[PDB]
Structure 1
């Protein structure tokens, strides 16, 4: 018997996690006049089996949903309700981005209770996660620091005015881009990673990557999408069928640096 009430879907394989699409059919709708942010697209699985967690994803400075869109179908097809947002202003700073990210989660939660909504009854509002690009990534980190009940965080190429995220207890995967010249790894992603001492955490640097290396249309969807889904499944669903995928060093030429902590596949 399956004893984890949050487990959804089939037992994963590397191939099934590297595929463009997961097991579940995904539909979408847009949120008009959102509560506390600029715009939003909600991606959801129609046949997950049960309620699933919610993920809110925020773009970088000047950026729009297009930059992060690919995560919507990718995560939703594995059993998550995902909202990609536009910020009130493309120029909003990381603190504002975090507020708007949390406002998008809050609206997903209200929608879950709205009978007219396509996601009525589809969300477990006690299981939420955060993702984003650059300032949006920083915003995710801020969201995690301010809201420790969040179950997971998977920011990409993050930047914030601070690199001290030592209070974060949320399991946090950082995608870094090796040749990032906007938010260099050495001054942003790595220090943010090093500051976190209280959580399960991972740092995955994409070989040859520019600041947009995890954005829609990237050349590493198979690896990045495998890792993003595995991380969210392992920590949002407590799904130990994803233990290896979430914690392993992908033995891949596509990865220029890999670090992980409190993500053990050993017994001691």
Structure 2
């Protein structure tokens, strides 16, 4: 019935694992169009076209900060492009422009017969992620392009307001962030968004890098990122229980969950 549904029925163990069920590969973008550099991660056996997600680092940072998301999401049925920005010193509006450029190049490569992702992407189903100024850029992308299916920034930094956002947005926040303090960034952004499905996962004791490659909470954080993108990029209500149901409630006793805010249930 759901034409976008891919893969086996999820379990807690399957979403906390380092990899999902699908086999994956990756390639470097030969000629990046409107951004600095990219790596594309993709499933080889997803069982149909999949949505695509663009992930952007923060100020001074590169793909290595955020690229654990590439194999983690791709192995659950997504095409993921992890980027470097034209300059490590680019600010959120610029990061957002580059993020959308990266999505546009994934759309271009999906129509290119020589590309490994030829005919693999549903070019109508796109999402945004990123760290710090790249997370603020994700929220800007969603504000400016409401046809995006999902946003899942981490420790976002921005000097912008997001009251108009209608895109389903998960913010991952790090309790002890001194760089994008939640009292100035994550929490005001969450409170501003009155028009969308939303959630805010706050990681206990986390510094600003608490959701980056190599983090010690990747089972938990990766479960939420994947379940958010499945629910909203694929309309896959099999994943609702991890966001709003009994599985979600079971997480709330974990030491690593400082706080969790949401406007469940998420109705179709």
Quickly name the TM-score band, shorter chain normalised.
over 0.9
In structure 2, the partner of 1:131 is: 129
Match of 1:108 among 103, 106, 109: 106
Cα separation, 2, equivalents of 1:8 and 1:114:
24
Cα separation, 1, equivalents of 2:159 and 2:31:
30
User: 1:246 and 2:247 equivalent?
Assistant: no
Deviates more, 1:29-38 or 1:244-253: 244-253
Cα separation, 1, equivalents of 2:241 and 2:233:
15
User: 1:220 and 2:227 equivalent?
Assistant: no
Cα separation, 2, equivalents of 1:104 and 1:35:
7
Q: How does 1:112-123 map to 2 (within 5 A)?
A: 112-123=110-121
Change (3 A) 1:52 1:265: closer
Maintained 8 Å contact 2:197/2:266: no
Q: Deviations over 1:28-61 (max 9, x none)?
A: 0000221100000000000000000000000000
Change (3 A) 1:161 1:243: same
In structure 2, the partner of 1:16 is: 14
Cα separation, 2, equivalents of 1:116 and 1:191:
45
Measure how far apart 1:155 and its partner are.
0.1
Report runs of 4+ in structure 1 exceeding 3 Å deviation. Answer: none
Deviates more, 1:251-260 or 1:137-146: 251-260
Change (3 A) 1:13 1:56: same
In structure 1, the partner of 2:171 is: 174
Cα separation, 2, equivalents of 1:134 and 1:148:
21
Q: Secondary structure at the match of 1:154?
A: strand
Cα separation, 1, equivalents of 2:115 and 2:255:
44
Cα separation, 2, equivalents of 1:39 and 1:232:
24
Cα separation, 2, equivalents of 1:182 and 1:240:
35
Cα separation, 2, equivalents of 1:33 and 1:190:
38
Cα separation, 1, equivalents of 2:62 and 2:181:
21
Match of 1:236 among 233, 236, 239: 233
In structure 2, the partner of 1:43 is: 41
In structure 1, the partner of 2:265 is: 264
Q: How does 1:149-168 map to 2 (within 5 A)?
A: 149-162=147-160, 164-168=161-165
Measure how far apart 1:265 and its partner are.
7.0
Q: Deviations over 1:158-214 (max 9, x none)?
A: 00012x200000000000000001111111100110000000000010000000000
Q: Deviations over 1:83-117 (max 9, x none)?
A: 00000000000000000000000000010000000
Q: How does 1:55-204 map to 2 (within 5 A)?
A: 55-162=53-160, 164-204=161-201
Q: Secondary structure at the match of 1:231?
A: helix
Cα separation, 2, equivalents of 1:190 and 1:105:
27
Q: Which runs of 5+ in 2 are unaligned?
A: none
Cα separation, 1, equivalents of 2:199 and 2:90:
27
Maintained 8 Å contact 2:162/2:192: yes
